[PDB]
Design an enzyme around this catalytic site. Sequence first.
Site, mmCIF file in Angstrom:
data_model
loop_
_atom_site.group_PDB
_atom_site.id
_atom_site.type_symbol
_atom_site.label_atom_id
_atom_site.label_comp_id
_atom_site.label_asym_id
_atom_site.label_seq_id
_atom_site.Cartn_x
_atom_site.Cartn_y
_atom_site.Cartn_z
ATOM 1 N N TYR A 1 15.228 22.230 25.093
ATOM 2 C CA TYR A 1 13.984 22.091 24.341
ATOM 3 C C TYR A 1 14.007 22.932 23.064
ATOM 4 O O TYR A 1 13.659 22.443 21.985
ATOM 5 C CB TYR A 1 12.789 22.465 25.222
ATOM 6 N N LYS B 1 14.400 21.220 19.185
ATOM 7 C CA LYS B 1 13.320 21.415 18.222
ATOM 8 C C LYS B 1 13.758 22.295 17.053
ATOM 9 O O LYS B 1 13.289 22.091 15.926
ATOM 10 C CB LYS B 1 12.103 22.001 18.931
HETATM 11 N N1 LIG Z 1 0.678 21.500 23.025
HETATM 12 C C1 LIG Z 1 1.422 20.426 22.772
HETATM 13 O O1 LIG Z 1 1.072 19.306 23.103
HETATM 14 C C2 LIG Z 1 2.734 20.605 22.068
HETATM 15 C C3 LIG Z 1 3.312 21.860 21.999
HETATM 16 C C4 LIG Z 1 4.530 22.005 21.352
HETATM 17 C C5 LIG Z 1 5.136 20.897 20.782
HETATM 18 N N2 LIG Z 1 4.560 19.699 20.876
HETATM 19 C C6 LIG Z 1 5.214 18.559 20.267
HETATM 20 O O2 LIG Z 1 4.194 17.816 19.616
HETATM 21 C C7 LIG Z 1 4.369 16.423 19.821
HETATM 22 C C8 LIG Z 1 3.152 15.877 20.549
HETATM 23 O O3 LIG Z 1 3.550 15.346 21.807
HETATM 24 P P1 LIG Z 1 2.755 15.691 23.157
HETATM 25 O O4 LIG Z 1 3.228 17.013 23.687
HETATM 26 O O5 LIG Z 1 1.293 15.474 22.894
HETATM 27 O O6 LIG Z 1 3.338 14.537 24.115
HETATM 28 P P2 LIG Z 1 2.537 13.853 25.328
HETATM 29 O O7 LIG Z 1 3.557 13.445 26.349
HETATM 30 O O8 LIG Z 1 1.381 14.724 25.730
HETATM 31 O O9 LIG Z 1 1.940 12.515 24.678
HETATM 32 C C9 LIG Z 1 2.154 12.184 23.314
HETATM 33 C C10 LIG Z 1 2.213 10.675 23.157
HETATM 34 O O10 LIG Z 1 3.518 10.290 22.745
HETATM 35 C C11 LIG Z 1 3.919 9.145 23.481
HETATM 36 N N3 LIG Z 1 5.374 9.097 23.680
HETATM 37 C C12 LIG Z 1 6.089 9.804 24.563
HETATM 38 N N4 LIG Z 1 7.405 9.493 24.479
HETATM 39 C C13 LIG Z 1 7.537 8.562 23.528
HETATM 40 C C14 LIG Z 1 8.655 7.796 22.937
HETATM 41 N N5 LIG Z 1 9.921 7.969 23.361
HETATM 42 N N6 LIG Z 1 8.358 6.920 21.963
HETATM 43 C C15 LIG Z 1 7.094 6.761 21.547
HETATM 44 N N7 LIG Z 1 6.028 7.406 22.023
HETATM 45 C C16 LIG Z 1 6.191 8.308 23.002
HETATM 46 C C17 LIG Z 1 3.220 9.260 24.819
HETATM 47 O O11 LIG Z 1 3.001 7.984 25.423
HETATM 48 C C18 LIG Z 1 1.928 9.943 24.457
HETATM 49 O O12 LIG Z 1 0.887 8.998 24.250
HETATM 50 C C19 LIG Z 1 5.654 16.281 20.611
HETATM 51 O O13 LIG Z 1 6.743 16.020 19.736
HETATM 52 C C20 LIG Z 1 5.834 17.617 21.280
HETATM 53 O O14 LIG Z 1 7.212 17.879 21.545
HETATM 54 C C21 LIG Z 1 3.384 19.528 21.492
#
Ligand SMILES: NC(=O)c1ccc[n+]([C@@H]2O[C@H](COP(=O)([O-])OP(=O)(O)OC[C@H]3O[C@@H](n4cnc5c(N)ncnc54)[C@H](O)[C@@H]3O)[C@@H](O)[C@H]2O)c1
Lengths: 230, 241
Positions: A155, A159
């Site tokens: 991870y 990133k």
């Molecule tokens: N607090 C957080 O949510 C957080 C923290 C650190 C980083 N991030 C990053 O921010 C971004 C937000 O994602 P998230 O954590 O909300 O994810 P999540 O799994 O909570 O959902 C985000 C959405 O992305 C969609 N998704 C998942 N895989 C996919 C794919 N291969 N192709 C297309 N759509 C896809 C899912 O269906 C979902 O609706 C991500 O890149 C994550 O790595 C988020």
Amino acid sequence: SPFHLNDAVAIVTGAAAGIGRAIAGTFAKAGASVVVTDLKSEGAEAVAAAIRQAGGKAIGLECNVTDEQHREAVIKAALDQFGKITVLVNNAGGGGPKPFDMPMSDFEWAFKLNLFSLFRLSQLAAPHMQKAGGGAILNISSMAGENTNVRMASYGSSKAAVNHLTRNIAFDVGPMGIRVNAIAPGAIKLKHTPLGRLGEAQDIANAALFLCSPAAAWISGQVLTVSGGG
Amino acid sequence: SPFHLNDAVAIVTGAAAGIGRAIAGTFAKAGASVVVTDLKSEGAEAVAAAIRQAGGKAIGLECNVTDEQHREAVIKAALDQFGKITVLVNNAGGGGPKPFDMPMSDFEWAFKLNLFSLFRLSQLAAPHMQKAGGGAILNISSMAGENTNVRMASYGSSKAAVNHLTRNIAFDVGPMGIRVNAIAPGAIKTPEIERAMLKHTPLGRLGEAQDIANAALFLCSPAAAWISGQVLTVSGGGVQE
Ligand SMILES: NC(=O)c1ccc[n+]([C@@H]2O[C@H](COP(=O)([O-])OP(=O)(O)OC[C@H]3O[C@@H](n4cnc5c(N)ncnc54)[C@H](O)[C@@H]3O)[C@@H](O)[C@H]2O)c1
Ligand SMILES: NC(=O)c1ccc[n+]([C@@H]2O[C@H](COP(=O)([O-])OP(=O)(O)OC[C@H]3O[C@@H](n4cnc5c(N)ncnc54)[C@H](O)[C@@H]3O)[C@@H](O)[C@H]2O)c1
């Protein structure tokens, strides 16, 4: 005023929920035509429909961002519907803590999902942005990309790769009129969060709007951490 | 709509010209009452007068930020004039290329001007910002804080101290409702030497003061309510040396 997206066409991935959902709706309210995509076709269509009922322009499309045909279908649907592409938000992604001895397919999947996907979508979108006279690419990264910890081999490194991709390809696509930035989101809904509350998806969306707007016209290659100070 | 500074009171230092002037004029257009300060009082007053005749609220004062009496006076005058302090933009600063064997007075002065001043001003402003329901501090740094080059002993290391101060005091004043961020500008245009800097600038043009002002407005606005401890570099994608 420069914080608006008038006449913009924004592709947003992972936009059925959360950060990507807020980005889709905020970008629409700021004037963008929004191509709402998600792994789940129903969730993408829901956010697109919700955007239309509120007065904006949006279509909803299924897109597994690790699928080369899904990616190309998104690109085409943006052009067929709105005639150009000027904004790409690579929000789709994931992963988390894993043991150091995880299977190699797990290590390799973090890079396909978090890095290979977007880089490819940026490749696909860049020529079209160039023809539209310019564009902004925004990658949603993660705080693990700059931090160091246990269980972060796949991870944190993937990133990290997203962050330095952002910094480097800004050199490649600047001359085409394209800016490239990243946001590193904190935890979204505390002893190491100076501002004393969790994040809201709207917090990430506001930073996204700035970085994708002409108010950030001379900002490229940057990783902005939105994390309440922690 | 989150990008406005409605009912804000912003102190801006070094604001008679360049980046500070653009910040003060932009903040006023966004709704902040602005205390325009500069080492040159009549330059500060001129900027305040133009903000007023454009429809905003502002006053102009003399402030050498290295002078503790001046620092207290600007704090007092902001409260006397507008009743509160919610935004502080530490834009005053200076220095540049210096030889390694410089007099120690030059080395120390870079820290007096670029670092001690804005730290003291942050200390004086913080309690009032907390009483006002929260605020933002914005430090204008430099890319020399992250870059490494010849002749940067005083300038490069004092601006790096600004970057890390920003990151660290974000932890101290966060619990008081105060955000602290920094902008590191590149070559801001306040013939052959131009062509060289563009050669390593992907976006193909030099910086403008309004570019810094736009990013300052964002970071001091409710749109950045959960952004703290950041050093945002505004450089057109590259470096300019
Ligand atoms: N607090 C957080 O949510 C957080 C923290 C650190 C980083 N991030 C990053 O921010 C971004 C937000 O994602 P998230 O954590 O909300 O994810 P999540 O799994 O909570 O959902 C985000 C959405 O992305 C969609 N998704 C998942 N895989 C996919 C794919 N291969 N192709 C297309 N759509 C896809 C899912 O269906 C979902 O609706 C991500 O890149 C994550 O790595 C988020
Ligand atoms: N290329 C750039 O413009 C650039 C690059 C990197 C960093 N910076 C930083 O951005 C800030 C803005 O400066 P600028 O480049 O616009 O310079 P500038 O000379 O255009 O404006 C600086 C203003 O600050 C005032 N000032 C100078 N010393 C002062 C003091 N001791 N107390 C109070 N006011 C004082 C000056 O009178 C002047 O009006 C500076 O801190 C500078 O170090 C600028």
